[PDB]
Amino acid sequence: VQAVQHVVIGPSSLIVHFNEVIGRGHFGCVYHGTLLDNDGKKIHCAVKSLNRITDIGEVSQFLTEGIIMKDFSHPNVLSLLGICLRGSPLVVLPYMKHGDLRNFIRNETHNPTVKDLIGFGLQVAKGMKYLASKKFVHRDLAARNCMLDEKFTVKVADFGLARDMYDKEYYSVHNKTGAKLPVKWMALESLQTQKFTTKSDVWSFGVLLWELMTRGAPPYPDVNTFDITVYLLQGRRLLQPEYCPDPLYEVMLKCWHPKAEMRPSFSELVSRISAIFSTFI
Numbered sequence: 001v002q003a004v005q006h007v008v009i010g011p012s013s014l015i016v017h018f019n020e021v022i023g024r025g026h027f028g029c030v031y032h033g034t035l036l037d038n039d040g041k042k043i044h045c046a047v048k049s050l051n052r053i054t055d056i057g058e059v060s061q062f063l064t065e066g067i068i069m070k071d072f073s074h075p076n077v078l079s080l081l082g083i084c085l086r087g088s089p090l091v092v093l094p095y096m097k098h099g100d101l102r103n104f105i106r107n108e109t110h111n112p113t114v115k116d117l118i119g120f121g122l123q124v125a126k127g128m129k130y131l132a133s134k135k136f137v138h139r140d141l142a143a144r145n146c147m148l149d150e151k152f153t154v155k156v157a158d159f160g161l162a163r164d165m166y167d168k169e170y171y172s173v174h175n176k177t178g179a180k181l182p183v184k185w186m187a188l189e190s191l192q193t194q195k196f197t198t199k200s201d202v203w204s205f206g207v208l209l210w211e212l213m214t215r216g217a218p219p220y221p222d223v224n225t226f227d228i229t230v231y232l233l234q235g236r237r238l239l240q241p242e243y244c245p246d247p248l249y250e251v252m253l254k255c256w257h258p259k260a261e262m263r264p265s266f267s268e269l270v271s272r273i274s275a276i277f278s279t280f281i
């Protein structure tokens with residue numbers, strides 16, 4: 001079965017600039033690339049290799065699980081330009097001028113305003129509302145996993161064929177299942193059961209909002225990965241950033257409610273954030 005044949009890129013249509021690495025996932029590196037379009041235009045692109053996973057079964061399972069991203073289409077969701085065969089399964093993605101969202105806001109030479117940062121979080125909410133509408137659970141939402149292109153458009157990434165660990169520091173590897181667990185972004189019920197829902201995506205989105213308002217500060221810097229579960233069980237949460245408006249912090253606190261049902265939907269989040277985005281800050 002090859003439904004991937006509808007997104008296959010011919011080898012003579014893609015040049016991978018192996019001398020230019022723009023990312024390092026556990027499954028392989030990310031390279032600068034040049035893609036020849038349908039209509040004969042040369043576009044800058046990013047090529048993600050999956051050569052680090054070496055098994056025909058584990059290759060094919062990753063492809064059919066991630067090929068669904070070809071059917072997704074939303075301005076705040078990273079798209080799939082195609083895959084190449086040869087060199088081991090290359091995944092061709094659009095190039096994002098400003099890289100991942102967390103690295104952009106952490107760079108001092110950049111001057112994002114408070115309104116810029118709220119707009120970034122609104123864009124993530126819109127992309128997640130689309131994914132939740134398609135009944136797709138992200139399970140690894142974080143600032144490091146969203147991209148920022150030339151037009152200041154945020155793309156929810158790190159899913160489907162783009163799923164990987166690009167920052168090993170924040171992940172724990174469960175020693176029975178293969179699960180890679182981003183401890184300090186996970187909902188409390190996810191730390192307890194290792195199950196993920198759209199409601200646990202809402203929790204992680206709250207942490208991402210907190211990341212934006214601090215311009216990339218690491219969450220819970222004084223709470224080790226063991227004490228985090230009791231810390232959350234005591235009702236303690238991430239504190240309000242100095243330059244986070246009060247209504248935005250209340251949105252964050254709603255995302256971290258102990259009852260997964262009680263948390264707002266992503267559609268409710270888009271409404272509350274865009275309302276905050278359009279008013280005086």
Ligand SMILES: Cn1cc(-c2cnc3ccc(CCn4nc(-c5cccc([N+](=O)[O-])c5)ccc4=O)cc3c2)cn1
Binds near residue numbers: 097100157163166
């Ligand atoms: C410094 N620069 C990086 C890019 C750049 C531009 N387009 C890209 C298109 C795809 C990918 C790989 C896919 N992908 N990557 C990351 C990611 C996360 C953290 C750090 C990096 N990283 O090391 O750049 C990448 C997160 C989600 C995701 O789906 C990386 C890209 C990186 C541009 N300038």
